[model samples]
Target: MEQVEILRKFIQRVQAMDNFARDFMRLRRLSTKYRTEKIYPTATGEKEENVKRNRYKDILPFDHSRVKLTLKTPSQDSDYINANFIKGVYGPKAYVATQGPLANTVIDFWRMIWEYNVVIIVMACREFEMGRKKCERYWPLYGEDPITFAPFKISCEDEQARTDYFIRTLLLEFQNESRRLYQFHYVNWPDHFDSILDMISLMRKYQEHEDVPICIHCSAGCGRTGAICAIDYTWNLLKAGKIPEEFNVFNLIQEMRTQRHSAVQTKEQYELVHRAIAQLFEKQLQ
Candidate 1:
């Protein structure tokens, strides 16, 4: 019943598995079969044009897991944002997993921030990837130039550039109301433990010990975002001196997909989740 022993056993189990890829494929099939049973919530439902506006067609959020806008007067459809509420192992509403904001959806992104009171944002993709635009330059790059979103104005107060990531202090203002926002921009995949640790630290600082949902997004919002959420969830359980009730990667992926479609995007991403946890477990022992 010891957490350390549980981790050791988990590592051994993963290492001992025969034909890891074969078994992994079987797990993928199981996820596909369970996809039919997943429910799409009416509250977060996407209109046809809204669906087309998404960067990726297959990576839309489910109705039940979608984050609803609290402000009603903005627009009748203001309640719908392409973001999902991914509950952590210890509690509900631990994270808001969403797609990288498209140029047209920038206002919706800010609305989610104001409504959800999001203090920390984890951006896993760069402005451009593979010679294509992965995410829009939503925030101001220079501290002087401010981007205004109707009632809200966004300005980068400061920025700290690092080898693998950039830490930015963003100031958001709305009709005399203002708040500080922290942005953790990672150039690499979210599987890196160092980035994950740094992100959690930022979350703690900006959230002020509150359980307010942290917003995480990547190009499609399903692959890297899901991987990081799973990593954070499993890591929390480990640090709490308790073994996750279900330590299986596939189970985590399935749970995530139930909240949002195509979570843990590719087979490579799926495998990366398992490998990253094993690395985290080993690092903890060290």
Candidate 2:
């Protein structure tokens, strides 16, 4: 009852355009407030030996909620991956937001996928952006040779180019076991309202698989990835008929930052979550 009442105000506010104008201002303050509240520990990610594993030195996974991989051998720092478990609106490991796989960390990326049995991956950034490498080509080309990361061999079985995104049918093998996964690679900007909704639709299409954490990544796993992860978290709540205790993007993002350090990295990304919610509701009305 309290939760229902909490969400109603948010619903009522988003239904009006003037309210969203103030909501944008609130979002900016929220982004700054949390950025300064960077008190979480990420000791493992910042160690001397783990420097090569991280895409950005400043942006590292929180020690508590980060996804850990299996060690290939004892006495080796093989468990760390630049990723974190992000909870959804209602509550579950909805997505594992990670930095784009660096060339040195691609093997660890596959290890995490196999270890977790991840079936869906979303890459918001390309292999190269702004004339620089963003992520290593962790998957094979459409018809190229199968690529192996030691215990894992990944092959692209098929590829479909949708208007807004591309779908790659990937087959992964680990010894006797094999699993097929889908990668939804959006070929557009993440900031545009329509594009954000389009990516939202991509995940909503496979709502039944929500329990399995979807792997999401961008350049540093900070800005774009963080924004979409927040969007998905909010969208899932309303889409599933789950009304939260309040229409508070601030609290929601704070939860995310607490789990994944700097989850919403920018004022624009923070506002993106509000606009996405506004659009999500209006789209329903339309």
Candidate 3:
């Protein structure tokens, strides 16, 4: 409680003197500070069998935390999904942050979700963004027939629209068993923290299980995905009274990179992390 208040005050001070110039300096420092970091085991993503499956060459998941998939069949190696299990400050197995599913990786994506029993998937990128296809349409559209990505037959059971995002109730069927999951598709992300917070509110609002991981991804799964994980991580810390009054998002991002080397990719995204934390504190305080 005091930490939240005090952290908010600290943010007021950081954005105080001159929001633009001071934040510019802070962002610059964070960027350079991150560049000086890391030594992790990401060699598995480079293996011949796994290399081509990645959307981006350098944004590999650390072998220590990379999400492992069950082989779809004996004739192939389908266990490599470009994802990592990231724990929140107080919750282990809190999130699986990964790249947007490639057209080729959609099966791997669904298999990852099915294997992890992931129920909440927060996609922060549009299926197509800025003149490019950023993510594959992995779920069935509202009125379309159920989409089958191998063993899982998924269909949209319902759809609810919010100003910043759309919430789809997804039903997954397999071997006469079923699971209902929620997909929060945030279209106006990367520019707004308040809206991101709103999406997180819905995430917490529907969480039925504590140990099940929520899957989150963006196009490259670095910048936007990292920001979401950082914000979600810190907010969870705040709720648990674990945040220091002097809580620093730059440090948190650095620590997060230890799990997935590319989390929080740039100076601006780093700044977004801080402002989003600041935003969270202010919202909770009010």
Candidate 4:
């Protein structure tokens, strides 16, 4: 938690605004922070606070019985990719954790998950060479040799090609081909609203066959990835006739914050998601 504090302080110094230094330093700090040792609090009040902080209750999935984000891994700083919790929600149980972005380890993790018929999904702040190796490891697990192994960056050099590759190869392809579930890795942050929404739009398009829920983790799984999941799931609930279209999207925003501090990160991203969902409903209502 000391390192988290350091980053938090730096975040404060930067006024919580995204900049080149903060982004680089924050990610760099995160890659190594996992190596620290943690001392649990023994006080009763501290224990309660810790539980309340880590445990995300009130996650009433639309299909209360069928789908949920079963709080498996509590949001805390732990070293060596703590895999203590298994979430069984929406018919797709998943195991999520944060480990050094190494390809061989990722592959081994997925191969183990394949036994349970679960899909492997990883999200990272930056793509390391190991991420590419994970792709190759993913091949045999799906029983098909993946012909292409590409690491995605936020480079808009070839606007259509790169963006289209993300939409088609990573998001759409995984959603379409997965027998049990779809998996994806979101790389860029502060992306245009349409870019993130497009990914969710693709995922929702094939919800029927989606066996396992998507696994989203952006380094800490609390900032960009956190915001994306909150908004996407909220939209999913709305479309399924679960949450009313009239409900305040701010409520969604608040709920995410309650789960993890600064989960949504930026007000702009939150508003974008709100407007996006409202637009969809407005069209339907019209």
Maximum-lDDT candidate: 3
C-alpha lDDT of candidate 3 relative to the true structure: 0.78
lDDT of each: 0.75, 0.76, 0.78, 0.39
How many clashing pairs in candidate 2? 0
* Candidate 3 C-alpha lDDT tens digits along 1-286: 4675776675685475335445446555654574457346677888988777899887788888888887463223567889998876556688888999888788788787877888899999899888999888999999999888656688888999987999999998766588899999998865427788878877888983448899999987778888888887777777877878657765677678767656777666766777778777776776
Which residue pairs collide, candidate 2? none
Model 1 agreement with the true structure over 117-189: per-residue lDDT tens digits: 8888888888988799999878988557888887678999899875578888999987778989888888876
Give a tens-digit lDDT track for model 4, residues 1-286. Answer: 3322332333243332335344434433443352233222113213333233221222111111121222222222211221222232233333333222234334233333333344435343454343533222232222233432222111111111224223223211221343333444445655445556666676556453335545555543454555566556655554555654335544554444433333445555554555555555444454
- What does candidate 3 score in Cα RMSD to the true structure? 3.0
Q: In model 1, which regions exceed 4 Å deviation?
A: 17-20, 37-46, 73-77, 190-210
Cα deviation at 85, candidate 4, in Å, is: 8.3
Q: What is the lDDT of residue 243 in candidate 2?
A: 53
TM-scores of all candidate predictions against the true structure: 0.88, 0.85, 0.88, 0.46
Cα-based lDDT at residue 257, candidate 3: 73
Kindly report the root-mean-square deviation of model 1 from the true structure over all alpha carbons: 2.8
In every candidate, how many clashes are there? 1, 0, 0, 1
Model 3 clashes, total count: 0
Local error of candidate 4 at 233, Å?
1.4
Cα displacement (Å) at residue 35, model 2 = 8.3
Q: What C-alpha lDDT does candidate 4 achieve relative to the native structure?
A: 0.39
> What is the lDDT for 10 in model 1?
74
